[PDB]
Amino acid sequence: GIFPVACADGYGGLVTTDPKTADPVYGKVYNPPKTNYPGRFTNLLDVAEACPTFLRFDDGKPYVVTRADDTRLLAKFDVSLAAKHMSNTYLSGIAQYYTQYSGTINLHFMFTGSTDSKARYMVAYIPPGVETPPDTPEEAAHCIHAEWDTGLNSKFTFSIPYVSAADYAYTASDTAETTNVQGWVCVYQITHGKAENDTLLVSASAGKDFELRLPIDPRTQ
């Protein structure tokens, strides 16, 4: 006799993300050596961490300009990988292919001013729960925030904390979403001395515990 076997209904169909392998047909090919080829990367986040990219402001510039007027709120944006300001970053470029995330996102501010341009800035994370972000450093001061001044060192880095009810969050934003689900980031200018027209470049990168899960192919094709 031979081995009895039940061919089960429901199984066997092809699934585009299945964990199997096809049967081979053209054997014994030895590839040209690619030993030690430069610039390899094995995890997207390794580059997302090492290479920060720029946010988009105003007209479409990668920086913020010091206000000469009495307004101190330099910029404000949604803490969302789908944020308009984050739309040109590599981080968002990757994020679109995942459903959820958690972790620290790092922001980098780099002053472009002249040696005689001086300033003092403040960045704050406004968690959700308030109706509108405060346009005043005084009001924002009550949030997790940091201030720093211009000097020998041009760059200042700040980590946007992951604080939410659920352990993960959506990288995308639903149309019903009125106020950003994860809050805002506000950048203020405490003061400046002869810093009119000078610039503040801001970029973003993944933090040590930034994580993306659940691959997704969402773009229109």
């Binding site: 585009t16 352990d167 969050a169 019903a176 009125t178 659940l214 997704i216 969402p218």
Partner: protein, 191 residues
């Protein structure tokens, strides 16, 4: 056995109190993991369907039982009888993704398609009821789902809770009785 009923402390007397012998029992069939581990039909369907265990029938063995718990957790298995190819998408995906083939897409193979899916919500556990004053910017949070599926047409959908975990039991009701003493019904018997 008398006790202070008010304290709500559990009291389980036994027939030994009046001369009996308590016997041996085997409760395999009332094991949560086991009992919830069978397929159940989802009645409302549409070419695009978001998997939500609450669409389960409220008097079905699985539905009733699920509803008799406040919080739960499980992986899932589905069986779908569909026309064309079936595409699944994880919790949190933009509806638009369902059109793309690089998302788990099972090519049509008769008679239907049986799949194994993972819990994919962002919460540590889900709920059958959620007392949200709002929960926004009998409605349960949108995040309470197992992803979505789409095909040219979806004729049947069976769902199966794997590794079920139930917490905080709540009311489980039987058929209400109008009859003077018992609910009587035709029980199978040979002809």
């Amino acid at each position: 056995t008398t006790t202070t009923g008010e304290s709500a402390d559990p009291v389980t007397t036994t027939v030994e109190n009046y001369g009996g012998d308590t016997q041996v029992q085997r409760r395999h069939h009332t094991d949560v993991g086991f009992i919830m581990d069978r397929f159940v039909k989802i009645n409302s369907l549409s070419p695009t369907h978001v998997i939500d265990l609450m669409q389960t029938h409220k008097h079905g063995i699985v539905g009733a039982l699920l509803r008799a718990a406040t919080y739960y957790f499980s992986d899932l298995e589905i069986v779908v009888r569909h026309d064309g190819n079936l595409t699944w998408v994880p919790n949190g995906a933009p509806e638009a993704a369902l059109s793309n083939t690089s998302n788990p897409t099972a090519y049509n193979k008769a008679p239907f398609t049986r799949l194994a899916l993972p819990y994919t919500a962002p919460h540590r556990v889900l709920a059958t009821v959620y007392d949200g004053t709002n929960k926004y910017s009998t409605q349960l949070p949108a995040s309470f789902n197992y992803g979505a599926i789409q095909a040219q047409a979806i004729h049947e959908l069976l769902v199966r809770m794997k590794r079920a975990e139930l917490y905080c039991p709540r009311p489980l009701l039987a058929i209400k009785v109008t009859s003077q003493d018992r609910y009587k019904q035709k029980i199978i018997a040979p002809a």
